[PDB]
Write a protein that binds this ligand. Structure first.
Ligand SMILES: Cc1cc2nc3c(=O)[nH]c(=O)nc-3n(C[C@H](O)[C@H](O)[C@H](O)COP(=O)(O)O)c2cc1C
Ligand SMILES: Cc1cc2nc3c(=O)[nH]c(=O)nc-3n(C[C@H](O)[C@H](O)[C@H](O)COP(=O)(O)O)c2cc1C
Ligand SMILES: CCC1C(=O)NC(=O)NC1=O
Ligand SMILES: CCC1C(=O)NC(=O)NC1=O
Lengths: 304, 307
């Protein structure tokens, strides 16, 4: 008599879990394994108009507490659009497409080509602003450009912020664009540095070793961003992303305001079978507490 | 082999010290730091008058570190100046004093009074520009502060910096800092600001102030801390870098030094273990150097292999 269902964007999702953009979603083979998984949904690699080879390797690296990466690598917008057009089994689960064009005009021309597919198949756009989102006049400009070129609602993937002045300023802008129906918090914590004791060298090649962090490192920052935008954007959905390894971690994201919960580093390490464990552990937590639906406690984090 | 550091006209027995705010608010704690094997110590960031700080609970231990929203509980500048002027045993180790006034003028007035004590006793100023419970997140304010202190204070001083997360900010802060010759060291980093922790069982935040949002310390911050140390090591070669963040072992300290750190500060781990941690950290850092054949820290400081 409990359910993990999430009724959002006019879809019933079986559970709140999906992959994070960039993790297990660049190839036909990986997307297939995600659609076959028990996840409530899935999202594609952040694609660019043309195919990109990717930064020099190694571009990812497993850490004791998480991951660091400088991936920079996609089959091109044409590939992922056609996957949404004629290859994704929408009878399994809804599909999100991530785009990260290098310009307002770039993204807009890409949204115009997706508006037909979105209309007839139902794929949902996540616009990766993460940095455009660390510069608020550029953010306001992309969102106006996209809102004018794209009839359909869409969402934004946000970088982490670390002070209330930035939370307030980001939220004030997002609340002026009604087509932005969800906000995903967070992308990686940017430009961390990992060094190997034995070799005395950085562990990824690009950018002198500086890359984005994921995993257990980012969890308190992710919860803070989820809850900060949940409080300030009550008219929008929040998708939590960052540091999820267990169903208790997911429970906390939901308590902070998350509608959907994305899984990055831990999925990279464990594979799509993780979703069978996450749904079970989450139902365990709710069973222990007597909760029957996610709506009963989403955003209900208490003060002391 | 040797852990000695020769900087700022002083000899430090080893690079370790407490992080500002940890084990340094009362005379008993400062005396315990002085009696420890640390190479140095720093006082709690002080304001012109005593403050009781934010209401408790305002510190909480996490699996991988800590979250806090102390809000500068401190005994007031006059207390720490007196400790520096009359109580500290400078034959044991050098001393830093951390000041964190709420405006540039508050800071300048404090520096004016510190100046003669610094001249006579040798205490060294660290200006806190990264009060998260932020000046350095606003670059023209940062430049105003630095000019105010430089006008008010005749000696070299250092600055405690919040973490930055992109090269444009690294470059912006570096460009300002290199314009002020009295800034002789940069401490990277203060807490990662405004994280949030929720207890599963109570479904409630774990610290009371600011809706539970507080600064993160400990293992969460270690890769960010190394990044900031190295970014400023590269962009400010005329200044020393002090590393702070995520140090629990001698290997963690080794990596800070490799990234460029001259001194290595210890916060959360010292809060949990107490001042005997410094006997363990020196032994562990010496063991790392022994396995690699290093006999002095200058043989690998800043020598991270990158690009
Ligand atoms: C290898 C890798 C590739 C990623 N690629 C993208 C991407 O293309 N677009 C995007 O918005 N986020 C990307 N991310 C960030 C993740 O979507 C996620 O925000 C981040 O890893 C934090 O979540 P986690 O703690 O579960 O890993 C990537 C992360 C990793 C580790
Ligand atoms: C309880 C507590 C109090 C702190 N008080 C100060 C302070 O007064 N001034 C300051 O510059 N930093 C203060 N900090 C930040 C530490 O100096 C340090 O930058 C941060 O904790 C990261 O180091 P760590 O990972 O070893 O904990 C405080 C940190 C903690 C946990
Ligand atoms: C542009 C995609 C990019 C990102 O946004 N986040 C990440 O972690 N790695 C990446 O390559
Ligand atoms: C303003 C003092 C302050 C600090 O600088 N860093 C921290 O973590 N907590 C604090 O209260």
């Amino acid at each position: 008599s409990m359910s993990l269902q999430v009724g959002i964007l006019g879809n019933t999702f079986a559970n709140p879990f999906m992959n994070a953009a960039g993790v297990m979603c660049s190839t036909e083979e990986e997307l297939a394994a995600m659609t076959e998984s028990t996840s409530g949904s899935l999202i594609t690699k952040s694609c660019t108009p043309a195919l990109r080879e990717g930064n020099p390797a190694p571009r990812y690296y497993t850490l004791p507490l998480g991951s660091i990466n400088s991936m920079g690598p996609n089959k091109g917008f044409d590939f992922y659009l056609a996957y949404s057009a004629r290859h994704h089994d929408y009878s399994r689960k809804p599909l999100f497409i991530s785009i990260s064009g290098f310009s307002a005009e770039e993204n807009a021309e890409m949204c115009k080509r997706l508006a037909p597919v979105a209309a007839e198949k139902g794929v949902i756009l996540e616009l990766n602003l993460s940095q455009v989102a660390y510069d608020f006049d550029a953010m306001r400009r992309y969102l106006a450009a996209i809102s004018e070129a794209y009839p359909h609602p869409f969402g934004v993937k946000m970088p982490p912020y670390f002070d209330f002045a930035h939370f307030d300023a980001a939220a004030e802008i997002l609340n002026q664009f009604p087509k932005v129906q969800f906000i995903t918090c967070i992308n990686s914590i940017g430009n961390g540095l990992v060094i190997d004791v034995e070799t005395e060298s950085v562990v990824i090649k690009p950018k002198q070793g500086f890359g984005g962090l994921g995993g257990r490192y980012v969890f308190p920052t992710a919860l803070a961003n989820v809850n900060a935008f949940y409080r300030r954007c009550p008219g929008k959905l929040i998708f939590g992303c960052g540091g999820v390894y267990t169903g208790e971690d997911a429970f906390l994201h939901v308590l902070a305001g998350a509608s959907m919960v994305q899984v990055g580093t831990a999925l990279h390490e464990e594979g799509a079978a993780i979703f069978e464990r996450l749904t079970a552990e989450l139902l365990d937590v709710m069973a222990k507490k007597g909760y029957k639906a996610l709506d009963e406690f989403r955003g209900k984090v208490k003060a002391m």
